[PDB]
Amino acid sequence: TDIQMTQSPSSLSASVGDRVTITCQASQDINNYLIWYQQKPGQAPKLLIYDASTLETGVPSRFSGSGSGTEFTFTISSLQPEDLATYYCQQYDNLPYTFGQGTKLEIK
Amino acid sequence: TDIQMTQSPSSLSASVGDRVTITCQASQDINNYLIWYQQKPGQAPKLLIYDASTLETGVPSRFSGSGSGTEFTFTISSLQPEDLATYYCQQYDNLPYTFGQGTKLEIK
């Protein structure tokens, strides 16, 4: 009865230059009130994308958000060595704001 | 103009039964639009307090939030071993929402 965010995958390993794709299903429609964060190890989440597809100022072109309704996607189109992190989607349509369980990226 | 949140401390040690105290400062008045999260290792942040001081469903009474406008405080009255976590403030007055840098809590 709060909103449940279903993020996939739980983890992934990929090489530098790879296209990384992450999905978030929302348990009910949220319009596009969804944010994507990046949590570098030992740091706070940092907002990359809001409104499901809007890049924050000074966020690199390789990050993008697709979707609206209940299915959303996050892409890093070419993965850089500084992109090692856990990425989270999050709805802000209604309090409480709920996070997907996250996608932990490792680099080879 | 984005809002910057200064969270302190960055890490502490305290013992079972101790008062733990954490502060968040906002660069601008943000009214009471302040969330406290708990992030257990491996897991997403989970929202404890919103609107500066309202506790979410089944957040224990030892936790509390106070403050308004700029200076905010998160207190655990008597520390319990299930509070092993990193706690974050986040402002939600204005997009982009911004996180404090977090307080990682260890027990002796």
Closest CA to B101 of B10, B21, B1: B10
Tell if the CB–CB gap between A44 and B92 is shorter than 8 Å. Answer: no
Show the 3-state SS of chain B.
CCCCEEEECCEEEECCCCCEEEEEEECCCCCCCEEEEEECCCCCEEEEEECCCEECCCCCCCEEEEEECCEEEEEECCCCHHHCEEEEEEECCCCCCEECCCEEEEEC
Report the gap between the CA of B56 and the closest CA in chain A (Å): 8
Write out chain A residues lying below 8 Å of B50, CB-based: 95-96
* Nearest-by-Cβ selection for A96 from B47, B98, B100: B47
Closest CA to A62 of A103, A96, A102, A21: A21
CB A13 within 8 Å of CB A103: no
Resolution of the model in angstroms: 2.4
User: B1-108 maps to which CATH number?
Assistant: 2.60.40.10
